[PDB]
Write a protein that binds this ligand. Structure first.
Ligand SMILES: *c1c2c(OC)c(OC)ccc2c2ccc3cc4c(cc3c2[n+]1C)OCO4
Ligand SMILES: [Ca+2]
Ligand SMILES: [Ca+2]
Ligand SMILES: [Ca+2]
Ligand SMILES: [Ca+2]
Lengths: 90, 89
């Protein structure tokens, strides 16, 4: 695969990894969203060490309101990060 | 991490193709066509007609400026990734 294709695959891969740990296997609960951020985005986002912060992060990302982050909400999260970085460099 | 590498790859591939012609920060039809044909060949059928690149740009150009900017590109990446995730469930 091309670099863009591996990137597409990794996003699906990483979401699946964290979402399939607890509860709903197709969604990220707070604990799952926290660890994904802490382990996998450690160079982009400040490590989450407060319950208020993980609550705020989930409130921001959960557009439908079921208290978890589904794949579509996760892709919206990836879009903000990538777009912010792109706007910075270009 | 793998997610971080993916974020960087998305920014780089867009920059790569957008920076060929015209506005270096956007994809014109020719740039978008080449990105799809060269970089997404295992997921999308190769574009071989003008009518197809015209319709693809029409779909992705949410603002109407005739080109695909980065957020429009991410919406595109989002379409593909979501489609594949939904495939497994
Ligand atoms: C998803 C994938 C993945 O991502 C997990 C992998 O992992 C090895 C393999 C293949 C695919 C896809 C295969 C075909 C396909 C076709 C179309 C898509 C998306 C895919 C795949 N996505 C990228 O969108 C429109 O047609
Ligand atoms: Ca879960
Ligand atoms: Ca949700
Ligand atoms: Ca361009
Ligand atoms: Ca546009």
């Amino acid at each position: 695969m091309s670099e863009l294709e591996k990137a597409v695959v990794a996003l699906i891969d990483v979401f699946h990894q964290y979402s399939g740990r607890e509860g709903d296997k197709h969604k990220l609960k707070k604990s799952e969203l926290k660890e994904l951020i802490n382990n996998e985005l450690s160079h982009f986002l400040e490590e989450i060490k407060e319950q208020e912060v993980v609550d705020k992060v989930m409130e921001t990302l959960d557009s439908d309101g079921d208290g978890e982050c589904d794949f579509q909400e996760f892709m919206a999260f990836v879009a903000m990060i990538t777009t912010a970085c792109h706007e910075f460099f270009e």
